[PDB]
Amino acid sequence: MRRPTPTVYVGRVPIGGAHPIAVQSMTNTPTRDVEATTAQVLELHRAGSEIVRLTVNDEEAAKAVPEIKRRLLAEGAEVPLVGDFHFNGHLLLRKYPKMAEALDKFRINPGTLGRGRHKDEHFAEMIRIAMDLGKPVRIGANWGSLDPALLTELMDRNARRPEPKSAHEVVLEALVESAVRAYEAALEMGLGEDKLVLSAKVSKARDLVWVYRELARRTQAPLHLGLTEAGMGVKGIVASAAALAPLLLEGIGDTIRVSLTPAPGEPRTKEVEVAQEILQALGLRAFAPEVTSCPGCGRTTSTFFQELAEEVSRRLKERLPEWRARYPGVEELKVAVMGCVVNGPGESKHAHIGISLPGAGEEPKAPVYADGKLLTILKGEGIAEEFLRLVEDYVKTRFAP
Amino acid sequence: MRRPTPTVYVGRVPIGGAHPIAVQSMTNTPTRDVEATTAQVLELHRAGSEIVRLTVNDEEAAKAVPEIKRRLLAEGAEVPLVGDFHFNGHLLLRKYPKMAEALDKFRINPGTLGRGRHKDEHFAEMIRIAMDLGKPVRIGANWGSLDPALLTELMDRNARRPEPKSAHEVVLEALVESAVRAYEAALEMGLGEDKLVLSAKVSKARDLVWVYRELARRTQAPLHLGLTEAGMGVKGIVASAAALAPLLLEGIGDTIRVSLTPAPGEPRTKEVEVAQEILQALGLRAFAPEVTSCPGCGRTTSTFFQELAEEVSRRLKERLPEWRARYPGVEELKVAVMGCVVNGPGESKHAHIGISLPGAGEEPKAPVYADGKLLTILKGEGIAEEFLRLVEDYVKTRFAP
Numbered sequence: 010m011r012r013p014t015p016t017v018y019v020g021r022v023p024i025g026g027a028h029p030i031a032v033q034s035m036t037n038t039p040t041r042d043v044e045a046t047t048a049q050v051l052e053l054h055r056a057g058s059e060i061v062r063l064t065v066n067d068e069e070a071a072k073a074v075p076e077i078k079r080r081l082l083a084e085g086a087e088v089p090l091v092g093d094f095h096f097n098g099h100l101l102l103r104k105y106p107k108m109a110e111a112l113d114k115f116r117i118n119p120g121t122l123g124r125g126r127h128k129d130e131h132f133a134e135m136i137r138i139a140m141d142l143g144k145p146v147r148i149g150a151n152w153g154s155l156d157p158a159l160l161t162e163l164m165d166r167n168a169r170r171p172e173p174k175s176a177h178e179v180v181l182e183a184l185v186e187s188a189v190r191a192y193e194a195a196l197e198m199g200l201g202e203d204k205l206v207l208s209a210k211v212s213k214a215r216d217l218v219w220v221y222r223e224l225a226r227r228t229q230a231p232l233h234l235g236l237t238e239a240g241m242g243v244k245g246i247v248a249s250a251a252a253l254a255p256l257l258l259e260g261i262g263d264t265i266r267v268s269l270t271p272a273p274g275e276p277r278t279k280e281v282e283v284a285q286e287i288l289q290a291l292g293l294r295a296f297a298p299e300v301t302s303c304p305g306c307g308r309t310t311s312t313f314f315q316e317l318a319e320e321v322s323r324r325l326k327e328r329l330p331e332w333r334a335r336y337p338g339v340e341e342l343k344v345a346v347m348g349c350v351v352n353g354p355g356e357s358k359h360a361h362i363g364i365s366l367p368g369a370g371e372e373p374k375a376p377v378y379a380d381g382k383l384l385t386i387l388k389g390e391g392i393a394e395e396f397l398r399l400v401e402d403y404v405k406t407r408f409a410p
Numbered sequence: 411m412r413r414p415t416p417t418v419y420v421g422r423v424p425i426g427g428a429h430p431i432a433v434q435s436m437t438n439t440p441t442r443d444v445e446a447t448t449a450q451v452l453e454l455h456r457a458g459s460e461i462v463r464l465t466v467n468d469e470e471a472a473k474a475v476p477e478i479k480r481r482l483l484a485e486g487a488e489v490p491l492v493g494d495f496h497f498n499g500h501l502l503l504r505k506y507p508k509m510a511e512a513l514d515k516f517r518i519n520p521g522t523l524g525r526g527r528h529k530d531e532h533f534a535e536m537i538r539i540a541m542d543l544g545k546p547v548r549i550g551a552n553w554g555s556l557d558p559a560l561l562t563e564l565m566d567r568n569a570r571r572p573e574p575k576s577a578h579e580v581v582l583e584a585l586v587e588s589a590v591r592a593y594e595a596a597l598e599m600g601l602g603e604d605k606l607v608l609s610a611k612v613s614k615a616r617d618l619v620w621v622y623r624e625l626a627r628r629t630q631a632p633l634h635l636g637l638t639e640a641g642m643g644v645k646g647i648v649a650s651a652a653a654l655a656p657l658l659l660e661g662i663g664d665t666i667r668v669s670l671t672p673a674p675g676e677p678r679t680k681e682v683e684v685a686q687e688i689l690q691a692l693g694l695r696a697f698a699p700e701v702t703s704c705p706g707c708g709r710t711t712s713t714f715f716q717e718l719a720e721e722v723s724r725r726l727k728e729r730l731p732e733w734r735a736r737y738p739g740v741e742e743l744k745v746a747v748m749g750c751v752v753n754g755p756g757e758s759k760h761a762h763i764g765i766s767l768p769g770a771g772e773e774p775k776a777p778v779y780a781d782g783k784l785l786t787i788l789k790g791e792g793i794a795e796e797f798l799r800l801v802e803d804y805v806k807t808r809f810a811p
């Protein structure tokens with residue numbers, strides 16, 4: 010189902026229909042703070058952020074970028090950097106060529122280029138710089154910063170229709186048009202199709218789906234997909250997954266970013282985890298072993314089952330660094346931990362390896378299945394440690410080099 | 411887009427294409443423990459569980475059900491109860507008619523009815539009881555308990571094809587067929603279309619989408635949609651949202667349950683919250699005011715912004731019980747809290763009411779927008795309390811009776 014697109018290299022990372030969907034994120038430290046920003050780029054990259062964006066908002070930020078890059082490279086960290094430009098990107102790129110060169114990609118927002126005639130000139134200057142330096146660009150529209158002149162143009166087109174659409178629908182048309190027009194203008198200037206990524210983000214899931222279907226149809230470019238301003242906590246996580254899944258399953262989207270608001274003191278790597286979970290849930294990429302477990306019900310003892318499931322999950326997380334190094338393919342491992350005989354054996358047979366605890370009315374023994382067939386039956390104390398040993402033995406055999 | 415279906419009443423709650431998608435859940439206490447189970451049904455219902463399921467696994471459980479029901483009614487709690495039957499449902503329903511009568515719905519699993527010839531007789535007996543008592547039934551297939559005789563029949567049909575499908579695909583065909591055959595058999599027995607709900611659950615998102623598309627096509631019934639055995643934590647939440655969204659946006663699904671494994675000590679109401687968030691994220695139902703907020707970046711001061719967003723979210727949660735009582739429609743309230751001028755004003759204008767903090771390079775003032783236009787501009791200490799007062803004033807005006 011994957012939409013074909015040209016490949017756009019962002020540093021060493023290829024983006025497009027022929028490549029895995031790349032996970033990205035954005036820093037939240039002040040870019041002028043070289044120490045804090047370098048540390049957080051490294052943190053995000055180590056969590057799985059294949060590309061990292063940072064705001065390049067003012068001259069102090071611009072002056073910091075080459076140093077951040079130098080420090081990354083000194084540790085052998087090859088993480089591509091995307092500069093986020095608004096209002097003054099043309100001035101910062103012009104004035105600070107070492108910043109322009111140190112970035113791996115420029116983001117432009119067609120709605121933050123300035124007013125009237127100035128918008129076209131500013132756009133052209135940034136595209137010129139990118140062309141001169143061989144850099145890729147994302148043309149990223151966002152409905153929080155929609156070009157007002159385009160909105161009026163589309164509102165007038167709407168008003169001439171025999172059956173005008175709602176104001177909200179016209180906003181979405183304008184957002185798509187903003188990105189498409191800017192894409193076509195960049196191509197016309199001579200920027201290559203191997204240098205252009207597009208996005209057009211809204212904060213409501215159902216709207217996002219509409220928008221990206223239009224962008225996918227109307228353009229050839231790789232698409233950067235995300236639900237902007239998703240918010241805090243569970244709501245942010247749910248909204249992000251809900252918005253992305255329909256599109257991802259239809260084959261639309263080449264890189265994703267999850268726009269979560271961190272709780273105070275929550276690490277900025279949560280968004281990377283959520284991004285990875287979305288792709289893995291959909292069978293698009295595999296990052297780490299996963300545990301399938303039942304909710305538990307009145308058929309099982311709640312504490313014991315919940316404790317075991319949690320213990321298995323924690324052990325897999327502990328073993329992963331080593332495993333990733335020794336056992337190619339282990340990222341695909343599926344482990345089941347189940348509460349009773351109703352679905353326990355069947356679900357366990359669908360995992361690589363799984364355990365079915367005894368629930369109410371059952372003899373106190375726990376079958377273990379691997380590769381769809383009975384492996385052993387556990388009893389007594391120490392079920393969890395025995396099971397984890399069996400998972401280790403399984404991994405070493407199944408994912409051996 | 412909503413798929414039309416007959417209405418099935420579960421107690422007082424209507425399920426079907428003409429009705430809101432109902433949120434449901436399942437208890438995890440031992441059903442024999444009347445006190446614990448009654449308490450948890452009440453807890454789940456107060457969190458938003460419009461229907462509550464409990465396992466009816468053995469005779470002690472069956473004997474408890476009428477008492478649970480009596481205690482609910484004594485508090486004026488009209489929450490419909492679904493009994494979850496496996497292996498011995500026909501015996502429990504037969505032997506305990508007061509249990510049969512106290513339930514509002516029976517769940518049958520076509521894969522947990524017994525072996526061979528026994529399966530048909532057991533199925534018929536449960537359907538007979540439901541018919542006698544006027545109860546609705548869910549015929550709920552699950553791939554953890556797939557009828558093995560049907561699987562073999564479909565594996566043989568597959569093997570005759572010019573291009574056989576994979577074993578995994580045949581499992582999914584068998585699961586659909588299990589539910590469809592049982593549905594058709596119940597209808598043929600005389601159970602009404604106003605008494606039959608269907609489900610056919612798997613634990614992988616992309617598979618769920620395939621299954622439910624087939625069930626929706628092949629049947630007329632309302633559908634109970636959920637991703638079974640979704641697991642723990644963020645993974646469970648993401649997988650559930652990812653699996654449900656594509657279907658919900660295509661108009662498929664009449665009731666949902668989110669199958670999360672609670673962490674030890676985590677309340678069983680988390681699944682209800684997640685269910686509600688899925689429906690609200692998709693614009694299908696509204697349960698509570700929501701906060702749209704940016705991720706924050708290097709343009710904003712991280713702590714202050716994150717703290718404000720969290721404070722606003724917490725206050726809305728605190729005010730909701732009162733608000734729900736005074737201000738019809740308040741569940742639809744959208745509040746924005748934004749980090750800087752880039753997207754702050756624009757996003758805030760899309761909310762009912764929103765605040766745009768000042769970010770880097772800006773004067774220290776925070777515009778507030780309501781109904782898409784500037785309401786005021788805040789400065790100094792106490793921005794959060796001033797803003798919350800403005801949100802209160804807004805609510806009282808906008809959602810007045």
Ligand SMILES: C/C(=C\COP(=O)(O)OP(=O)(O)O)CO
Binds near residue numbers: 149150151154268752
């Ligand atoms: C930093 C920012 C918005 C918040 O990030 P998002 O990643 O949500 O959206 P976008 O940047 O438009 O791709 C600027 O539009």
Ligand SMILES: C/C(=C\COP(=O)(O)OP(=O)(O)O)CO
Binds near residue numbers: 304306494555
């Ligand atoms: C209790 C149980 C499974 C876990 O609940 P689920 O709600 O995940 O699945 P189902 O019951 O099949 O609707 C029995 O199949």
Ligand code: SF4
Binds near residue numbers: 305308309347348352
């Ligand atoms: S496997 Fe058993 S304990 Fe777990 S939710 Fe299913 S029926 Fe309940």
Ligand code: SF4
Binds near residue numbers: 709751753
């Ligand atoms: S509104 Fe401003 S502070 Fe918030 S993420 Fe967007 S650009 Fe950064």
